[PDB]
Amino acid sequence: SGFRKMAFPSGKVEGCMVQVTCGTTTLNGLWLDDVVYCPRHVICTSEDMLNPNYEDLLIRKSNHNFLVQAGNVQLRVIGHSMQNCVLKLKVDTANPKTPKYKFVRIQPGQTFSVLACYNGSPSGVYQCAMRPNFTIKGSFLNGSCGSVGFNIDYDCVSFCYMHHMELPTGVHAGTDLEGNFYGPFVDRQTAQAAGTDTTITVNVLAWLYAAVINGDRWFLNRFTTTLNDFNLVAMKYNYEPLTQDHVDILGPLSAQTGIAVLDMCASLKELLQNGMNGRTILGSALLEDEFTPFDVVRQCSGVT
Amino acid sequence: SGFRKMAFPSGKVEGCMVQVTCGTTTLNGLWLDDVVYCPRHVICTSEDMLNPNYEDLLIRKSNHNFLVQAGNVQLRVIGHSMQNCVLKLKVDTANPKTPKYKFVRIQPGQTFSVLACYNGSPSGVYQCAMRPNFTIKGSFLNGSCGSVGFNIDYDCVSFCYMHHMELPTGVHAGTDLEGNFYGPFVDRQTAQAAGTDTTITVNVLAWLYAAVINGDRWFLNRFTTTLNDFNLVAMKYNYEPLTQDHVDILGPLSAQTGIAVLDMCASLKELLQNGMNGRTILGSALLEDEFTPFDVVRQCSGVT
Ligand SMILES: Cc1ccncc1NC(=O)[C@@H](C)c1cc(Cl)cc(O[C@@H]2CC(=O)N2)c1
Ligand SMILES: Cc1ccncc1NC(=O)[C@@H](C)c1cc(Cl)cc(O[C@@H]2CC(=O)N2)c1
Numbered sequence A, B: 001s002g003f004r005k006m007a008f009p010s011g012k013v014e015g016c017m018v019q020v021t022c023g024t025t026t027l028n029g030l031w032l033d034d035v036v037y038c039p040r041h042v043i044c045t046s047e048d049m050l051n052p053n054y055e056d057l058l059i060r061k062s063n064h065n066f067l068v069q070a071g072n073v074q075l076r077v078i079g080h081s082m083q084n085c086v087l088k089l090k091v092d093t094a095n096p097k098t099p100k101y102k103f104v105r106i107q108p109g110q111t112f113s114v115l116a117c118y119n120g121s122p123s124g125v126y127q128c129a130m131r132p133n134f135t136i137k138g139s140f141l142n143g144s145c146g147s148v149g150f151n152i153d154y155d156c157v158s159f160c161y162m163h164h165m166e167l168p169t170g171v172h173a174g175t176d177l178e179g180n181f182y183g184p185f186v187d188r189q190t191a192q193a194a195g196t197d198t199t200i201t202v203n204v205l206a207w208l209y210a211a212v213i214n215g216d217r218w219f220l221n222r223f224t225t226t227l228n229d230f231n232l233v234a235m236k237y238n239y240e241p242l243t244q245d246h247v248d249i250l251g252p253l254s255a256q257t258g259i260a261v262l263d264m265c266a267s268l269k270e271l272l273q274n275g276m277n278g279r280t281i282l283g284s285a286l287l288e289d290e291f292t293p294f295d296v297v298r299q300c301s302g303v304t
Helices: A053-057 A201-213 A227-236 A243-251 A250-256 A261-274 A292-299 B054-059 B201-213 B226-235 B244-249 B251-257 B259-276 B293-301
Strands: A017-024 A025-032 A033-037 A068-070 A073-075 A077-083 A086-091 A101-102 A111-118 A123-131 A146-155 A156-166 A172-175 B017-022 B027-031 B035-039 B066-070 B074-075 B077-083 B086-091 B100-103 B111-118 B119-128 B148-152 B154-165 B170-174
Touching: A017 A033, A017 A292, A017 B244, A025 A068, A033 A156, A053 A077, A068 A077, A068 A086, A111 A156, A201 A243, A201 A250, A201 A261, A201 A292, A227 A261, A243 A250, A250 A261, B017 B035, B017 B119, B027 B066, B027 B293, B035 B154, B054 B077, B066 B077, B066 B086, B111 B154, B111 B170, B201 B251, B201 B259, B201 B293, B226 B259, B244 B251, B251 B293
Parallel strands: A101 A156, B100 B154
Antiparallel strands: A017 A025, A017 A068, A025 A033, A033 A086, A068 A073, A077 A086, A111 A123, A111 A146, A146 A156, A156 A172, B017 B027, B017 B066, B027 B035, B035 B086, B066 B074, B077 B086, B111 B119, B111 B148, B148 B154, B154 B170
16 A cells, blocks of 8 residues: 555666767767667757747857767767657667667657756656646756656657656756757747646546545545536636546546546536635645556555 | 755666566676675575575575676676675675665664665666664565665765565665664564664754755744753654764754754744644655755855
């Protein structure tokens, strides 16, 4: 028993972290096979991050201007190209520590682990979610760019996120491993609108099932609701509308606990309308939405 | 910016996880050099966990009864001994992946990362604290015994915890890497009293400094207090008494923010007496006490 915001073991990803230096800028790169992936804003001086012409800026750059260091050893760059907002540096040596990997573009509401890095060195691992407004509420400082978000399925690492920037609001924006930003964000130092961030309803419900599974049952009531009645409440509280797909995904948790999804929705509705009244659920005083139904099942069954 | 419950990268510890089987029991072991460390309750059948005589139970066990597997390869056990509540299995092969390591016994209030494991395989990493009552609020299931708690300083892993049991209350108990339990707990299936769990005052204060450092300043007031006035409030709310050592440890955070420790204590006092009033601090609706002043400085400065 017990329920914690658990990240994936970071070992397979630590062996991929390298340092990329271009002129005066140092950030992180991901070394997989003979390619180093990093944010293209590595080629930007501070004077041009305001409105950069990346194509023009990259032309003034040659293979020898990209310094790639894996630990204490220098990697030889034999190729360089720009794919959307990431640079791909072809190196002459394949990473001996390359794990089995996939590049995947996650959906909002999905979760992933981040290995925060500085100068190609890992500093920490935390679990987060792609928010419905495509931002991530992470912990990143200057030098953390190029830090990656991933998931693990047995032995295969699915890379889903690369850190590119912090908005003036303190939230984080970045791309998939093909360089496409999640959301409407651009790698430009300009006023960018994050957008309204709703609560991931299906995740809050999955966490309510985890709470029941771990003994916290105070919030369970004698009521039920309908998808349309629950969704009227969800709209008022800026919660994502719950669909039949969400009910279906919650199926195994509903089966394991013997609590129908719509009954849990009525508990959620009562918590939304009345609040916690000074009580906690899994040691939290707010409704947690960064655990997917898959995360709950995984953590409550012990998948390694 | 941003503040998250961040665990250490788990790679160096993943390379040490092995599976130990004794009769019908399978749990995790820690392989460092030519020794595998694991909970001695590996030798216990279910019928004898109620009141085991470990010395007598171990006598009926030989080196060949301890099955140690590192991934898919079997390790040859050439020695076995009991040190307090851990068994030390001497194997004929040193772990090629042994990192630089220390065995340390942490203080209550200190934090550490846990690599939850099942069958010698890592499943997740989370950050937790040794509670003032010597328990840990972790996430552990059957098979997780032998999972370790550690800290990292540059390249040296300081092992501080080994998971042994869950109390009927849902909290977790375990030992240091010499087999001595943290707290009054025994590796026996009996009714054990966890004890009153107070809040780690110095950690809540460190987290209030992290909140200010990251923009959350609503809780700052026009008041101050004294150590004795603050401690009268701390006692009422089951908070650890704040000492001059705690004030001294908070020094660098006080210097960085320009907010005197006693002024922050008055903010804490007002939050304790009045509550959050529906507001949040670093995305939390309660006062967080599982970040030490060292964790706050580390995460706010980017130490790798
Ligand atoms: C300094 C910092 C702290 C933590 N993590 C990453 C960072 N990154 C940043 O804030 C920096 C270097 C940056 C890069 C890019 Cl590609 C775009 C930028 O514009 C921001 C987005 C917005 O709105 N204004 C800013
Ligand atoms: C089943 C489980 C779940 C998660 N993590 C570890 C576990 N462990 C346990 O609860 C088991 C196997 C256990 C071992 C030991 Cl050494 C002592 C025990 O007594 C408990 C302590 C108390 O009070 N009663 C119990």
